[PDB]
Design a protein around this ligand. Sequence first.
Ligand SMILES: O=C(O)c1cc(C(=O)O)c2c(n1)C(=O)C(=O)c1cc(C(=O)O)[nH]c1-2
Ligand SMILES: O=C(O)c1cc(C(=O)O)c2c(n1)C(=O)C(=O)c1cc(C(=O)O)[nH]c1-2
Ligand SMILES: [Ca+2]
Ligand SMILES: [Ca+2]
Lengths: 571, 571, 69, 69
Amino acid sequence: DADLDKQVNTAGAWPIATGGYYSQHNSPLAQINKSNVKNVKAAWSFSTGVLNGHEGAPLVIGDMMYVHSAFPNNTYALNLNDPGKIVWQHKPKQDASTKAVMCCDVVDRGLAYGAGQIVKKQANGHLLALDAKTGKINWEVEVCDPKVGSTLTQAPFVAKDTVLMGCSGAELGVRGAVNAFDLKTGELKWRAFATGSDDSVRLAKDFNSANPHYGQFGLGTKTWEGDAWKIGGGTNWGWYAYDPKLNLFYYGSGNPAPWNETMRPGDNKWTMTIWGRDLDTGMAKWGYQKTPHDEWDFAGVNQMVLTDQPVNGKMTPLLSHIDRNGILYTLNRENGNLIVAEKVDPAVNVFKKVDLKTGTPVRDPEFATRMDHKGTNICPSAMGFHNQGVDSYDPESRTLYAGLNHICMDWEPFMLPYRAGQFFVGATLAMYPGPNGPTKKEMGQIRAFDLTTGKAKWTKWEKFAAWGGTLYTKGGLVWYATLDGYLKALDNKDGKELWNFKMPSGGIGSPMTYSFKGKQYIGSMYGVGGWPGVGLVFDLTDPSAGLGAVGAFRELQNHTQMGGGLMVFSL
Amino acid sequence: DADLDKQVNTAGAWPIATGGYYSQHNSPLAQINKSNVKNVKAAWSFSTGVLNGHEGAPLVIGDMMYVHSAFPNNTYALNLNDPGKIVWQHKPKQDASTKAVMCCDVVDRGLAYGAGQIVKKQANGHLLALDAKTGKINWEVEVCDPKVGSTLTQAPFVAKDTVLMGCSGAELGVRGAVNAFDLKTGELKWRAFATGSDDSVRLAKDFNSANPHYGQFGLGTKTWEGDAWKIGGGTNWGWYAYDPKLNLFYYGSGNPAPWNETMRPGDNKWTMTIWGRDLDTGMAKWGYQKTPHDEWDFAGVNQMVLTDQPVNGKMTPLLSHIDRNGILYTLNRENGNLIVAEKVDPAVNVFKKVDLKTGTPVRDPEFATRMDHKGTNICPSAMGFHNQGVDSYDPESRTLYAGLNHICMDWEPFMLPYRAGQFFVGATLAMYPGPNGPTKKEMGQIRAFDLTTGKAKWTKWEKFAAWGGTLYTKGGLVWYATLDGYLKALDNKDGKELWNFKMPSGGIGSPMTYSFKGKQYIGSMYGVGGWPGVGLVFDLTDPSAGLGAVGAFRELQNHTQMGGGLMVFSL
Amino acid sequence: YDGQNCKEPGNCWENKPGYPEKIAGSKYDPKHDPVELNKQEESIKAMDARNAKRIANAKSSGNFVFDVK
Amino acid sequence: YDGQNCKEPGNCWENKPGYPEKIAGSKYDPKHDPVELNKQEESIKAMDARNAKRIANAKSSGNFVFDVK
Ligand SMILES: O=C(O)c1cc(C(=O)O)c2c(n1)C(=O)C(=O)c1cc(C(=O)O)[nH]c1-2
Ligand SMILES: O=C(O)c1cc(C(=O)O)c2c(n1)C(=O)C(=O)c1cc(C(=O)O)[nH]c1-2
Ligand SMILES: [Ca+2]
Ligand SMILES: [Ca+2]
């Protein structure tokens, strides 16, 4: 809205989880630079009083900082004048059974802000608008229902007078949808489902007019057999982006359900789709299905980054994105045209490649999944070559700094019934390091990409997956947190490590930055969890447990324990 | 042992909870000093992954650091060469019921080290010795039984081949005893009760021979009506001190049970008394009861500080201690002679004073407690003017830097039965700040004392109780952690603040210091709890709840939240 | 099944060798229970009603309150 | 009751004005249950025998085991 744009345009403020409408997650603050980064030290800290993964990052508006925790989703307001004191706090009352329906740790990706309001959700399905000054609740509505396996985890997105919010639960057969709510009243504007009729999917009259081959009308029913689409998945629990000139918003819908591909023949549209939808009506202008008939849980919800760059000399309005499938995608954001569809790592084997003319992946049958068969050495794993991390872009060098995962798996499905409110997966996996690490044990990488060619400038290896993302600050640094507990700073130029600090616990969010009384600060949540840490936060031992994850991160315990908090740094 | 003697003699090691045999809790390290202090900065941190009160401080032996948490009492071994790696960890499997028979948070005051083993306990009553390099369990015995409301919380103490352990539980009517085990095999040596027959209590034939008016033989039962002493309290859950020359160890025994004074006529001996016992036999050499017939829950367990100071210009072996009752006591550690007995704050009103001739508190009826009567404005409160914290001693200026509480109460008792394994308090309280705070609001003070005159050199007021203690380093600084979350460094001369840092959560332990590769580090636990944080920790709203503590600490909630870990600082 | 053989635009699915073209009636028939399949819609429906009662309930008074009937 | 009137050395207790000198038979009689009182003793006896059982079945083998019996 207007208030949001004011904060957006105020230097050193941080009112959007993603960095700005365009989600480049970067910053113009240049107080900390490659030449004085060595001198950065911890400034202050704050504990949330909750355990489990602490994803997201705090918000800064004016001289206030809003922090959030894992379930049960507490919110704390702090005047930067005095971090020692908690101006207001919001502590929801939520039934513990909510946790039983959250697939991947009881996480929360953050808060939103609009119209002098802090917008926050609860895992249990509620969404509220609280005065940013006093914490008084303005409106509170139900969005999802935990009884059918639907919960909330993503950060709300505010644009104009609307708040976008989608529920989680594809692992429990939840049919995904983006819900748009009135910022001032919390009344529902519309809802755009990822499956079913075009009316429910909300497709505009000219949907895919520039790329008829992507598919158009009647496919959210026609690419399924019978009623399977009703519990067809496609939840969007990732990040959003917005182009104010075009009035379009972008996001990816998730994986189809069950995981057992044999139980849902069909392209399963419009799951695994990148969207360009009108903000006011919610009608799709374009739709690109990245992964027809997913056989690997490559949920397509990753962050969307909008950039304006020259392609073959023509300045083009772009959308870039790294999917779980291991493909870096660049499209024209106005029309959905596909420009780049490249492997982020040579180990990607589910596809031989993506045909720019057909616009679909050329499948390698050797790495497919199917009943009565055990697929091995599949890359990427369900966890993907990229997950929920929030990457950064340097507008000057025109590079994206990506936190990738380097994990592969074995998989074999099994038949199961669907019962509402109960898990609907149907697969057994074993996950392990991919093949390219230097000692062949590394599962993370910081990779610098050119978005117009999809070529890597440099690579930095990490023992563990680079789950949270990176931050780019004009001083020429790429900042990130590791699962083993360090916040790091690299030279954007060659990825060389210039600084680091050992935080109490692993970080699974992306770092943020702000100004306060002339000094730039760096903030980072801490507290391992999310999918990588379920073995640790739940004390699992079965390698097969935690959807295959436990076996893969078994050594994380020797480096970190749970936590819950924020650490702020500066010069 | 010789192994501990070695560690104690090594510069920069920290093998004893209290700082050494004498428990002066200080350090000759002077790399950080008054001129330096402003530049100390966080060096690294560690989360235990447990919430609740984090009492005690870690042990440093060679290049290894040993960290401990609240219940379930896990142990983490770290090599100082790379704090990021957890060499070995010990994580007990304990029943969750244990928690319900613990009066003041599921705290743990720490580890002990002896004969190249880590001596550690578990809240559920087990005591163990683990190799310090591998963490392999050498021996495991049972010391207490939670089914009769008996649990472990204090740090083990090691001297020669003996480990001393005492169970907690007087609020559940548990009869206190100091248990002695063989360092090497964990077999029981002797047990010395606080009540009962001379044989159970273990008085030597020369018991109090130098101060016969203190009392001698048979008081264990005559100062009690019937078998009331059988569930008489007197547990020792505080700190110890030891004199290798004399071969005597000292400690305080706790409060008599129930809190309801009218249910247990008598002097209730030998509860609330300072002891001088032979380490080898456990036979009492001297014993002085500070609060005969307790009426306020002033459990007499506080730290014993041994010094060598001039008294009347002659050098004397002293024992010092600030009791919960609000009196600073100085005795001769040799025969138990009363040298000093002064009020730590003029606010103390239970006693007119303590008569050095009769060696008895001159009780004031107006401030006593009895059935059918609600006592009001009683100072100190049950939380006392000094609790569980470990204070320091500057051997040069001969100053003790004390962490005091400034809290008073309202008290009215009530009758109730006794059921082995249930709470036995029988009193209802209301607590509030004492009267001398500069705004009548402060509840804490750091006060410096002369132990031979019992007079105060200076006072620094704090918003909340100074629960954890203080550490003294030769650089001229007094280091302490606060309930509201900061670690502070004061100028020992005047108590002026030189530095502070905002930790994730308030601190309930005392800082420790160590050296690693020629660099001095200050270590502190974080994670508020203990009696003060019960409202915040269990979600209590009732002022009367948490034994009256909830009302007192209502505001803590707006300053900090739970947490659990370690922060290390250095230049 | 390479993904390249399309029946019509946006529909390129093919059965893998030895797997049926249609699942219904096969050894892989999911045999979904319609009563189960309709739960989400019913739930949404009910949720919408409750929420609509709340915004109205406070658009007329000026004080949000969640509890409605 | 000021603490200065001692029947015997180290025994200076006195009833407060209006209170029995002896609790039994009065309205303030705790009426304690003997068997309840002995519960702690029985507990120590037991546990003590367990540890002798633990340490003994170890001085002989060379290998310590807690889960003794
Ligand atoms: O399909 C879903 O609805 C859904 C939801 C979520 C989530 O909300 O956390 C995750 C996933 N899927 C998922 O596939 C996934 O790999 C994942 C990782 C995490 C996390 O934060 O670590 N959340 C989720
Ligand atoms: O009577 C006892 O046996 C006993 C035990 C403990 C304990 O172990 O924590 C405390 C107390 N009393 C007690 O009176 C008390 O004020 C207290 C404070 C705390 C704490 O850790 O902060 N523990 C205890
Ligand atoms: Ca999913
Ligand atoms: Ca007590």
